[PDB]
Amino acid sequence: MYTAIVNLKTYREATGANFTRFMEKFEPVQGKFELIFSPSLLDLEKAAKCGKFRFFAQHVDAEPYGAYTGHVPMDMMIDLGITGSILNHSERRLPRDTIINTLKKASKLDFTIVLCVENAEEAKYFREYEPDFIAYEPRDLIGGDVSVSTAKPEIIEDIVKIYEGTGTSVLVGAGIKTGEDVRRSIGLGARGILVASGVVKSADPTKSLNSLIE
Amino acid sequence: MYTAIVNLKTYREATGANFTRFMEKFEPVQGKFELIFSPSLLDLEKAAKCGKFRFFAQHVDAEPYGAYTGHVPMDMMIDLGITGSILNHSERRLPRDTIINTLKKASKLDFTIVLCVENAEEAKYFREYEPDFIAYEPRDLIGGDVSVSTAKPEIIEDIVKIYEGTGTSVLVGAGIKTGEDVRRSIGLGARGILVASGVVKSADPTKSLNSLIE
C-alpha cells in the first residue's frame, strides 16, 4: 500500500561497474512498501535485464524512436522492460510544456510517471494532467540531514490535500534518514517516500533501507 | 587521417535489442578513415563493454559523480571506457555556457568532444574554447537526400577557414549518401564526415558505409 523509491542518482557507489555489486546486497521485501529503485540512465538496460527489483528511470523523453540524437525515449525503455520514470527531479528540471507532453504520452502507454515538484503551487498546476505519483521534494533539503517531514510538515499536508480523492499518490523526499522520518511522513498523509543519500551513502545500505521501511 | 562518425541516433534498427545485431554486420576498416560509432545513451555501456569499434556518446554532461538525477556524466563514461562524445547536435542543442563548461572539463581529461554547429558564426563563437572537432551540420538538411557538400559548399569553406591552423578538425554532415558526397566534402577542406540515415536506414549498412569511405 506504500511506495519507497531509492534514487541512485549518479553516485559512485551505485553506478557503472558498481551497480551490480551495489544491488547484489539487497533482497526483495514483503511489507507495506512496494520497493522501486532508480538507476542511472547508463545502467538502466543492465538493470532491466536482471529485473530482480522493479526499476524506474531517472528521466524520460517523449520523442519516439528515430532521429533524436542524445535522447532516452519512453518507447525504448518500454521495449527494455522499464515500466516507469521519475520526471522533473530538482536536479533535472524541465519546461512545463515538455512535462505535459510527456505525461500525456505516458497516460496512453501504461508507463508510470513519478512527477517531482518543489512546492504546492507546482503540485496544483499539474493536477489536471493526472500524474501517477507526485513527489514533493524541497530543493534546498536534498542531500542534507534534515527530513522533509521535520522541515515542511504543512507543505506536505497542503499537497496531500490538493490530491485527495484523485488517482494520484503523494510521495515525499529530501533528507529522509530514519524510520521516524518515514512514520512522520505517512502520519502527515503521504503514501510513501523517496530516498537517496540515506541509503546509498550508508555503511550498510541494506540495513539502512530496512530501517526506513519497518 | 580522416574521421567518419556513424550516428545511430535513436533509430529502431540500431538501438536496444537491435544494437548488437546491427553492429555484428560491420568489420573494422583499414583506409584513410578512422571509424567511430555513436550509440544511443541507453546502449552505451553495452557498446563500451565490447569495444570492437571506437564508440562516442551522443551527448555528455559535465557534472561529476554525485547527486545528479538523470545525468550522463563524463566521469562515468570515462570509467566505462568511452573516450568521447558528440555535443550540441541539432536534435540536442544546449545553452552556450553549458557547452563552454563541458569543453573546459573535457580539455582537462583527454576526453574528445565533437562539437556540432549550425552555421559559420556559431563555429567562430566557439573557436577560442578549442574543440577537438567541429561538426558542421545544417539543421534543415539533416535526414534529407541533399548532401551538405552539394547544398552548402561555401559555408564548409568558411568554417574550414575559421579553423585553419588550429588543432581543431572540421567535419561535415547532413544528407551524406554517396562516395561522391564524401569526396566533395574532403575536396572543400573537411577532414571527415558524419552520417546517420544513409547508413542506418540502408538495405546493407556495411556496404553503404564502405561506399562512403572508399
Ligand SMILES: O=P(O)(O)OC[C@H](O)CO
Ligand atoms: O535527500 P536525499 O539524498 O535522500 O535525496 C532525495 C532524492 O532527491 C529523491 O529523489
Ligand SMILES: O=P(O)(O)OC[C@H](O)CO
Ligand atoms: O542526414 P543524416 O541522416 O546523415 O544525419 C546526419 C546526422 O545529423 C549526423 O550526426
Ligand SMILES: [Cl-]
Ligand atoms: Cl559519488
Ligand SMILES: [Cl-]
Ligand atoms: Cl526508427
